[PDB]
GROMACS .gro file of N, CA and C in nm:
model
  288
    1UNK      N    1  -0.125  -0.316   1.763
    1UNK     CA    2  -0.273  -0.334   1.751
    1UNK      C    3  -0.350  -0.200   1.746
    2UNK      N    4  -0.441  -0.185   1.649
    2UNK     CA    5  -0.446  -0.275   1.536
    2UNK      C    6  -0.357  -0.216   1.428
    3UNK      N    7  -0.254  -0.291   1.391
    3UNK     CA    8  -0.162  -0.246   1.286
    3UNK      C    9  -0.212  -0.277   1.145
    4UNK      N   10  -0.191  -0.182   1.054
    4UNK     CA   11  -0.207  -0.203   0.909
    4UNK      C   12  -0.093  -0.135   0.833
    5UNK      N   13  -0.058  -0.188   0.717
    5UNK     CA   14   0.039  -0.122   0.631
    5UNK      C   15  -0.031  -0.066   0.507
    6UNK      N   16  -0.043   0.066   0.501
    6UNK     CA   17  -0.093   0.131   0.381
    6UNK      C   18   0.018   0.141   0.277
    7UNK      N   19  -0.008   0.093   0.156
    7UNK     CA   20   0.084   0.107   0.046
    7UNK      C   21   0.024   0.207  -0.053
    8UNK      N   22   0.091   0.321  -0.065
    8UNK     CA   23   0.049   0.424  -0.157
    8UNK      C   24   0.115   0.402  -0.292
    9UNK      N   25   0.032   0.402  -0.397
    9UNK     CA   26   0.078   0.375  -0.535
    9UNK      C   27   0.026   0.480  -0.631
   10UNK      N   28   0.073   0.474  -0.756
   10UNK     CA   29   0.016   0.553  -0.864
   10UNK      C   30   0.045   0.482  -0.996
   11UNK      N   31  -0.031   0.516  -1.103
   11UNK     CA   32  -0.003   0.463  -1.237
   11UNK      C   33   0.140   0.486  -1.284
   12UNK      N   34   0.197   0.386  -1.351
   12UNK     CA   35   0.335   0.398  -1.402
   12UNK      C   36   0.442   0.387  -1.294
   13UNK      N   37   0.403   0.343  -1.174
   13UNK     CA   38   0.502   0.326  -1.067
   13UNK      C   39   0.573   0.190  -1.080
   14UNK      N   40   0.686   0.190  -1.150
   14UNK     CA   41   0.767   0.069  -1.167
   14UNK      C   42   0.804   0.006  -1.031
   15UNK      N   43   0.843   0.087  -0.933
   15UNK     CA   44   0.884   0.030  -0.805
   15UNK      C   45   0.768  -0.030  -0.726
   16UNK      N   46   0.647   0.026  -0.743
   16UNK     CA   47   0.524  -0.035  -0.691
   16UNK      C   48   0.503  -0.173  -0.753
   17UNK      N   49   0.515  -0.184  -0.885
   17UNK     CA   50   0.494  -0.310  -0.956
   17UNK      C   51   0.598  -0.413  -0.911
   18UNK      N   52   0.720  -0.367  -0.887
   18UNK     CA   53   0.825  -0.450  -0.833
   18UNK      C   54   0.790  -0.506  -0.695
   19UNK      N   55   0.737  -0.425  -0.607
   19UNK     CA   56   0.684  -0.469  -0.482
   19UNK      C   57   0.572  -0.570  -0.497
   20UNK      N   58   0.477  -0.545  -0.588
   20UNK     CA   59   0.363  -0.633  -0.613
   20UNK      C   60   0.405  -0.771  -0.660
   21UNK      N   61   0.512  -0.777  -0.738
   21UNK     CA   62   0.561  -0.901  -0.790
   21UNK      C   63   0.647  -0.974  -0.687
   22UNK      N   64   0.723  -0.900  -0.606
   22UNK     CA   65   0.828  -0.960  -0.525
   22UNK      C   66   0.784  -0.988  -0.381
   23UNK      N   67   0.724  -0.889  -0.317
   23UNK     CA   68   0.689  -0.901  -0.174
   23UNK      C   69   0.543  -0.941  -0.154
   24UNK      N   70   0.453  -0.878  -0.228
   24UNK     CA   71   0.308  -0.895  -0.207
   24UNK      C   72   0.261  -1.044  -0.196
   25UNK      N   73   0.304  -1.133  -0.287
   25UNK     CA   74   0.257  -1.275  -0.274
   25UNK      C   75   0.299  -1.342  -0.142
   26UNK      N   76   0.422  -1.317  -0.097
   26UNK     CA   77   0.474  -1.368   0.030
   26UNK      C   78   0.407  -1.301   0.147
   27UNK      N   79   0.375  -1.172   0.132
   27UNK     CA   80   0.344  -1.085   0.246
   27UNK      C   81   0.241  -1.137   0.352
   28UNK      N   82   0.118  -1.173   0.309
   28UNK     CA   83   0.019  -1.220   0.407
   28UNK      C   84   0.047  -1.363   0.460
   29UNK      N   85   0.153  -1.425   0.409
   29UNK     CA   86   0.189  -1.561   0.447
   29UNK      C   87   0.304  -1.560   0.548
   30UNK      N   88   0.351  -1.440   0.584
   30UNK     CA   89   0.465  -1.422   0.677
   30UNK      C   90   0.412  -1.366   0.809
   31UNK      N   91   0.489  -1.380   0.916
   31UNK     CA   92   0.455  -1.319   1.044
   31UNK      C   93   0.438  -1.167   1.036
   32UNK      N   94   0.531  -1.097   0.968
   32UNK     CA   95   0.523  -0.951   0.951
   32UNK      C   96   0.397  -0.911   0.876
   33UNK      N   97   0.374  -0.980   0.764
   33UNK     CA   98   0.258  -0.956   0.682
   33UNK      C   99   0.133  -0.971   0.763
   34UNK      N  100   0.132  -1.071   0.849
   34UNK     CA  101   0.016  -1.101   0.931
   34UNK      C  102  -0.001  -1.004   1.049
   35UNK      N  103   0.109  -0.951   1.103
   35UNK     CA  104   0.104  -0.849   1.208
   35UNK      C  105   0.052  -0.713   1.156
   36UNK      N  106   0.077  -0.683   1.029
   36UNK     CA  107   0.037  -0.554   0.969
   36UNK      C  108  -0.014  -0.573   0.826
   37UNK      N  109  -0.141  -0.615   0.810
   37UNK     CA  110  -0.194  -0.646   0.678
   37UNK      C  111  -0.189  -0.525   0.585
   38UNK      N  112  -0.154  -0.549   0.459
   38UNK     CA  113  -0.137  -0.441   0.362
   38UNK      C  114  -0.271  -0.395   0.304
   39UNK      N  115  -0.280  -0.265   0.280
   39UNK     CA  116  -0.395  -0.202   0.216
   39UNK      C  117  -0.341  -0.101   0.116
   40UNK      N  118  -0.379  -0.116  -0.012
   40UNK     CA  119  -0.329  -0.029  -0.117
   40UNK      C  120  -0.419   0.092  -0.135
   41UNK      N  121  -0.358   0.208  -0.156
   41UNK     CA  122  -0.428   0.330  -0.185
   41UNK      C  123  -0.354   0.403  -0.295
   42UNK      N  124  -0.425   0.493  -0.362
   42UNK     CA  125  -0.366   0.580  -0.460
   42UNK      C  126  -0.319   0.709  -0.395
   43UNK      N  127  -0.195   0.749  -0.425
   43UNK     CA  128  -0.139   0.873  -0.368
   43UNK      C  129  -0.228   0.996  -0.388
   44UNK      N  130  -0.288   1.010  -0.505
   44UNK     CA  131  -0.361   1.132  -0.538
   44UNK      C  132  -0.510   1.136  -0.498
   45UNK      N  133  -0.562   1.024  -0.451
   45UNK     CA  134  -0.699   1.018  -0.398
   45UNK      C  135  -0.709   1.080  -0.259
   46UNK      N  136  -0.829   1.126  -0.219
   46UNK     CA  137  -0.851   1.161  -0.079
   46UNK      C  138  -0.828   1.039   0.010
   47UNK      N  139  -0.786   1.062   0.134
   47UNK     CA  140  -0.766   0.951   0.229
   47UNK      C  141  -0.898   0.891   0.275
   48UNK      N  142  -0.900   0.760   0.307
   48UNK     CA  143  -1.019   0.706   0.372
   48UNK      C  144  -1.053   0.791   0.494
   49UNK      N  145  -1.182   0.813   0.521
   49UNK     CA  146  -1.222   0.887   0.640
   49UNK      C  147  -1.159   0.834   0.769
   50UNK      N  148  -1.122   0.923   0.860
   50UNK     CA  149  -1.069   0.885   0.991
   50UNK      C  150  -0.918   0.861   0.999
   51UNK      N  151  -0.854   0.840   0.884
   51UNK     CA  152  -0.712   0.805   0.881
   51UNK      C  153  -0.625   0.929   0.898
   52UNK      N  154  -0.536   0.926   0.996
   52UNK     CA  155  -0.459   1.044   1.032
   52UNK      C  156  -0.311   1.019   0.998
   53UNK      N  157  -0.259   1.089   0.898
   53UNK     CA  158  -0.118   1.077   0.863
   53UNK      C  159  -0.036   1.191   0.920
   54UNK      N  160   0.092   1.164   0.946
   54UNK     CA  161   0.184   1.264   1.002
   54UNK      C  162   0.217   1.372   0.901
   55UNK      N  163   0.218   1.336   0.772
   55UNK     CA  164   0.247   1.429   0.663
   55UNK      C  165   0.193   1.372   0.532
   56UNK      N  166   0.184   1.456   0.425
   56UNK     CA  167   0.137   1.405   0.295
   56UNK      C  168   0.220   1.287   0.244
   57UNK      N  169   0.159   1.204   0.160
   57UNK     CA  170   0.236   1.110   0.079
   57UNK      C  171   0.276   1.179  -0.052
   58UNK      N  172   0.406   1.186  -0.077
   58UNK     CA  173   0.455   1.252  -0.197
   58UNK      C  174   0.541   1.162  -0.285
   59UNK      N  175   0.567   1.040  -0.239
   59UNK     CA  176   0.652   0.948  -0.310
   59UNK      C  177   0.580   0.813  -0.318
   60UNK      N  178   0.590   0.745  -0.431
   60UNK     CA  179   0.538   0.607  -0.442
   60UNK      C  180   0.651   0.514  -0.484
   61UNK      N  181   0.658   0.391  -0.426
   61UNK     CA  182   0.572   0.342  -0.319
   61UNK      C  183   0.607   0.403  -0.182
   62UNK      N  184   0.505   0.437  -0.104
   62UNK     CA  185   0.525   0.464   0.039
   62UNK      C  186   0.440   0.365   0.118
   63UNK      N  187   0.497   0.311   0.226
   63UNK     CA  188   0.426   0.216   0.314
   63UNK      C  189   0.411   0.285   0.448
   64UNK      N  190   0.288   0.317   0.487
   64UNK     CA  191   0.268   0.381   0.615
   64UNK      C  192   0.219   0.276   0.715
   65UNK      N  193   0.294   0.255   0.822
   65UNK     CA  194   0.245   0.172   0.932
   65UNK      C  195   0.150   0.251   1.021
   66UNK      N  196   0.025   0.205   1.026
   66UNK     CA  197  -0.080   0.268   1.108
   66UNK      C  198  -0.105   0.188   1.232
   67UNK      N  199  -0.118   0.256   1.345
   67UNK     CA  200  -0.162   0.196   1.472
   67UNK      C  201  -0.301   0.253   1.495
   68UNK      N  202  -0.402   0.171   1.470
   68UNK     CA  203  -0.535   0.222   1.468
   68UNK      C  204  -0.552   0.317   1.350
   69UNK      N  205  -0.601   0.436   1.377
   69UNK     CA  206  -0.624   0.531   1.267
   69UNK      C  207  -0.513   0.635   1.256
   70UNK      N  208  -0.400   0.611   1.324
   70UNK     CA  209  -0.291   0.710   1.328
   70UNK      C  210  -0.158   0.650   1.283
   71UNK      N  211  -0.089   0.725   1.198
   71UNK     CA  212   0.040   0.685   1.148
   71UNK      C  213   0.135   0.667   1.265
   72UNK      N  214   0.198   0.550   1.269
   72UNK     CA  215   0.307   0.522   1.363
   72UNK      C  216   0.444   0.556   1.298
   73UNK      N  217   0.460   0.524   1.170
   73UNK     CA  218   0.586   0.550   1.100
   73UNK      C  219   0.567   0.510   0.955
   74UNK      N  220   0.667   0.534   0.871
   74UNK     CA  221   0.656   0.500   0.729
   74UNK      C  222   0.788   0.462   0.667
   75UNK      N  223   0.781   0.393   0.553
   75UNK     CA  224   0.897   0.363   0.469
   75UNK      C  225   0.868   0.424   0.333
   76UNK      N  226   0.963   0.495   0.282
   76UNK     CA  227   0.955   0.552   0.153
   76UNK      C  228   1.044   0.485   0.053
   77UNK      N  229   0.983   0.426  -0.046
   77UNK     CA  230   1.057   0.350  -0.144
   77UNK      C  231   1.061   0.199  -0.128
   78UNK      N  232   1.116   0.134  -0.229
   78UNK     CA  233   1.143  -0.007  -0.231
   78UNK      C  234   1.278  -0.038  -0.299
   79UNK      N  235   1.388  -0.019  -0.228
   79UNK     CA  236   1.523  -0.054  -0.278
   79UNK      C  237   1.549  -0.203  -0.293
   80UNK      N  238   1.459  -0.287  -0.243
   80UNK     CA  239   1.471  -0.432  -0.263
   80UNK      C  240   1.418  -0.508  -0.144
   81UNK      N  241   1.401  -0.639  -0.160
   81UNK     CA  242   1.340  -0.724  -0.059
   81UNK      C  243   1.411  -0.714   0.073
   82UNK      N  244   1.545  -0.715   0.070
   82UNK     CA  245   1.623  -0.721   0.194
   82UNK      C  246   1.622  -0.589   0.269
   83UNK      N  247   1.580  -0.484   0.202
   83UNK     CA  248   1.564  -0.352   0.265
   83UNK      C  249   1.428  -0.342   0.330
   84UNK      N  250   1.328  -0.397   0.264
   84UNK     CA  251   1.190  -0.388   0.309
   84UNK      C  252   1.166  -0.455   0.443
   85UNK      N  253   1.203  -0.583   0.453
   85UNK     CA  254   1.170  -0.662   0.572
   85UNK      C  255   1.224  -0.607   0.703
   86UNK      N  256   1.355  -0.576   0.710
   86UNK     CA  257   1.405  -0.529   0.841
   86UNK      C  258   1.363  -0.385   0.873
   87UNK      N  259   1.340  -0.303   0.772
   87UNK     CA  260   1.295  -0.165   0.798
   87UNK      C  261   1.149  -0.164   0.843
   88UNK      N  262   1.069  -0.256   0.788
   88UNK     CA  263   0.933  -0.272   0.833
   88UNK      C  264   0.934  -0.324   0.979
   89UNK      N  265   1.018  -0.423   1.007
   89UNK     CA  266   1.028  -0.478   1.142
   89UNK      C  267   1.057  -0.370   1.244
   90UNK      N  268   1.148  -0.276   1.212
   90UNK     CA  269   1.175  -0.162   1.300
   90UNK      C  270   1.049  -0.078   1.325
   91UNK      N  271   0.972  -0.052   1.220
   91UNK     CA  272   0.847   0.017   1.238
   91UNK      C  273   0.749  -0.061   1.328
   92UNK      N  274   0.736  -0.192   1.305
   92UNK     CA  275   0.642  -0.275   1.384
   92UNK      C  276   0.682  -0.279   1.530
   93UNK      N  277   0.813  -0.292   1.553
   93UNK     CA  278   0.872  -0.289   1.686
   93UNK      C  279   0.843  -0.164   1.766
   94UNK      N  280   0.842  -0.048   1.700
   94UNK     CA  281   0.820   0.077   1.770
   94UNK      C  282   0.672   0.108   1.793
   95UNK      N  283   0.584   0.046   1.719
   95UNK     CA  284   0.443   0.053   1.748
   95UNK      C  285   0.401  -0.035   1.866
   96UNK      N  286   0.488  -0.121   1.913
   96UNK     CA  287   0.472  -0.170   2.048
   96UNK      C  288   0.600  -0.191   2.122
   0.00000   0.00000   0.00000
């Protein structure tokens, strides 16, 4: 609390589009999705005010788990559905 998942994207990001097609529709309908609602941002834009990351985003897709306005942890990449869910769960688990 309050958890959010920032998804950093950019134009021509095939793996981002893969995430959008595969995970995104399910995401807010799942317990995980509901524990950490997703918010999309562009890698090359300035960050929303107040948001504190541990390091730059240099890879897309990157999913940063935020606890309040501070990065708790992140996942870099989307190797597939079965990789996403349990790695995200580990991040959610460590934020509480």
